Design an enzyme around this catalytic site. Structure first.
Site, PDB file in Angstrom:
ATOM      1  N   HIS A   1      21.161 -34.408 -18.211  1.00 26.67           N
ATOM      2  CA  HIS A   1      21.761 -33.774 -19.343  1.00 26.67           C
ATOM      3  C   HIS A   1      22.037 -34.807 -20.440  1.00 26.67           C
ATOM      4  CE1 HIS A   1      24.792 -31.586 -21.732  1.00 26.67           C
ATOM      5  NE2 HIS A   1      24.133 -30.504 -21.361  1.00 26.67           N
TER       6      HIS A   1
ATOM      7  N   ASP B   1      29.280 -37.156 -22.590  1.00 30.06           N
ATOM      8  CA  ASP B   1      28.361 -36.229 -21.931  1.00 30.06           C
ATOM      9  C   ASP B   1      28.316 -36.619 -20.424  1.00 30.06           C
ATOM     10  OD1 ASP B   1      25.806 -34.822 -21.240  1.00 30.06           O
ATOM     11  OD2 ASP B   1      25.685 -34.488 -23.456  1.00 30.06           O
TER      12      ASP B   1
ATOM     13  N   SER C   1      25.524 -28.126 -26.492  1.00 34.87           N
ATOM     14  CA  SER C   1      25.493 -29.596 -26.525  1.00 34.87           C
ATOM     15  C   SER C   1      24.298 -30.102 -27.367  1.00 34.87           C
ATOM     16  CB  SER C   1      25.494 -30.216 -25.110  1.00 34.87           C
ATOM     17  OG  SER C   1      24.539 -29.624 -24.233  1.00 34.87           O
TER      18      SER C   1
HETATM   19 CL    CL Z   1      31.002 -34.088 -21.373  1.00 34.70          CL
HETATM   20 ZN    ZN Z   2      24.598 -28.616 -22.262  1.00 36.52          ZN
END
Ligand code: CL
Ligand code: ZN
Ligand code: ZN
Ligand code: ZN
Ligand code: ZN
Ligand code: ZN
Ligand code: ZN
Ligand code: ZN
Length: 369
Positions: free
Chosen positions: A101, A70, A312
Site C-alpha cells: 500500500h 501510510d 489514499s
Molecule cells: Cl496510515
Molecule cells: Zn488505501
C-alpha cells in the site's frame, strides 16, 4: 449541536515513535501485482486526466520533501524513500511495507519515470520520507482494556499514535505531509483526539507544512455520512447531518481533505463524504509502482485480483500537486498552497459538495492559471 473540532495548541504530543500499545506481526507480507495482459507502455488514465506530462513543464517537485504517513515503503531507485519512523513495529524505521500500500502511495506522489513504461509520479524529483502508521499484518498484543471506553479502543490508540507521527513528520522537515490514515468513529461516541488537532496545527502553523488527508473509504466503522439538509440553510455543509467522524479529515481547513473520483469523473462510491471534504482526485483503477519500482495495477483480494483503489490515492495526487506548487512558488504559505489547489479545481454541479468539496484538482491550472 455537532461542532467542528476546536484546536488546543497546548496539547501537542511528545515527539516519540512506536505504537500506542504493543503490536505483533501475525501475517506474511503482501505484495502488489498486475492484471493478466496489462500493457504499461500507455499512460495511466489518471496521468492523462490530470495532464501530468504538461504539468511537468512547470514543476517536478525538485527541492521538496514529502512525508508519507501510510503502511511503510519498500524502497527502490524509482521510489527512493527515506526512513521516517515506525508507529506499528516498535523497532522499525518506516522502510518496510507489509501491506502493498504505502509503497504504491509514495510512487503516485513521487515515483520516477522509466523508458520501459508510461508511469511517472506527480512530483518525480521530490524526496519521500516514509512513516509507517498502519498495517493489516499486525495485531495488538493481548491487553487488559476496558471495552466500554472509547479512549481504549484500537481507533483511539491509532489516533494517539497518529498525533505523534504528525509531530515527528513535521520535525523531519517535510514541506508536504500526506496522511493516508482516515480513522472513523460515531459522533455519539467521541474519542479524545485533542492531540491530533494540536499536531496538525503544529505541522501547519509552526513548521510550515502543507497537510493533505484522505477522505477515507466506507466499510466497517466507516459508514457513509448523509448529505446536507437543504431546508437548513444556516448549515450548507450539513455538519448537523453527520453520523461518522473521519479524522484527521475533519480538521479542515487546517488540512485539505481529498475525496475520490473514478475514470468517468464521478464521485467514487466508497469515498467518505462530509462537511470537511475540500477537493478530489483519481481513486479507482490506479496504476502505481511496487517494491522493485515495477508497474502494478492489482492487489490480491479474497476471491482473486482487485483493482488498486482508495482515497489514499486521491490524497497522493494532491500531495504531489502541493509539492509541484511549493517548488514553483516557494514563497507560498501552506494556506495559500491549499487555497490555490481548491480555487483552480473543477467545481461540481452544486459549486461545493460533501463528496468532492471544491472539485477535482487541475494541476496545470494550479501551476499556471
Ligand atoms: Cl496510515
Ligand atoms: Zn488505501
Ligand atoms: Zn452539541
Ligand atoms: Zn459550543
Ligand atoms: Zn525517541
Ligand atoms: Zn494509519
Ligand atoms: Zn521525532
Ligand atoms: Zn492557518
Amino acid at each position: 449541536m455537532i461542532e467542528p473540532p476546536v484546536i488546543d495548541p497546548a496539547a501537542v504530543p511528545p515527539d516519540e515513535t512506536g505504537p500506542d500499545n504493543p503490536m505483533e506481526q501475525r501475517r506474511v507480507c503482501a505484495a502488489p501485482t498486475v492484471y493478466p495482459d496489462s500493457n504499461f507502455a500507455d499512460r495511466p488514465w489518471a496521468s492523462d486526466y490530470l495532464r501530468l506530462t504538461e504539468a511537468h513543464k512547470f514543476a517536478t517537485g525538485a527541492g521538496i520533501t514529502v512525508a508519507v504517513i501510510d503502511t511503510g515503503v519498500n524502497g527502490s531507485p524509482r521510489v527512493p524513500a527515506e526512513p521516517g519512523g515506525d508507529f506499528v513495529d516498535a523497532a522499525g524505521n518506516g522502510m518496510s511495507d507489509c501491506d502493498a500500500h504505502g509503497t504504491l502511495t509514495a510512487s503516485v506522489i513521487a515515483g520516477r519515470g522509466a523508458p520501459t513504461d508510461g508511469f511517472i509520479g506527480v512530483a518525480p524529483d521530490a524526496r519521500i520520507l516514509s512513516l509507517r502508521h498502519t498495517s493489516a499484518a499486525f495485531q495488538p498484543v493481548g491487553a487488559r482494556t476496558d471495552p466500554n471506553n472509547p479512549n481504549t479502543t484500537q481507533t483511539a490508540g491509532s489516533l494517539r499514535s497518529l498525533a505523534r507521527a504528525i509531530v515527528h513528520a513535521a520535525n523531519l522537515g517535510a514541506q508536504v505531509i500526506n496522511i493516508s490514515e482516515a480513522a472513523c468513529y460515531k459522533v455519539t461516541r467521541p474519542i479524545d483526539e485533542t492531540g491530533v488537532g494540536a499536531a496538525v496545527n503544529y505541522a501547519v502553523h509552526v513548521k510550515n507544512a502543507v497537510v493533505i488527508a484522505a477522505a477515507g473509504n466506507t466499510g466497517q466503522d466507516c459508514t457513509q455520512n448523509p448529505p446536507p439538509d437543504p431546508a437548513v440553510p444556516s448549515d450548507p455543509r450539513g455538519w448537523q447531518q453527520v453520523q461518522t467522524i473521519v479524522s484527521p479529515a475533519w480538521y479542515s481547513p487546517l488540512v485539505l481533505t481529498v475525496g475520490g473520483i473514478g475514470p468517468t469523473g464521478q464521485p467514487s462510491n466508497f469515498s467518505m463524504s462530509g462537511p470537511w471534504v475540500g477537493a478530489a482526485a483519481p481513486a479507482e483503477n490506479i496504476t502505481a509502482l511496487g517494491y522493485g519500482g515495477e508497474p502494478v495495477n492489482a492487489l490480491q483480494g479474497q476471491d482473486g485480483l482487485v483493482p488498486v483503489a482508495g482515497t489514499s490515492f486521491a490524497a497522493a495526487y494532491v500531495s504531489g500537486l502541493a509539492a509541484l506548487i511549493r517548488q514553483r512558488y516557494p514563497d507560498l504559505t501552506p494556506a495559500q498552497v491549499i487555497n490555490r489547489i481548491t480555487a483552480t479545481a473543477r467545481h461540481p454541479g452544486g459549486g461545493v459538495d460533501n463528496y468532492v468539496g471544491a472539485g477535482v484538482i487541475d494541476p496545470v491550472a494550479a501551476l499556471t492559471w
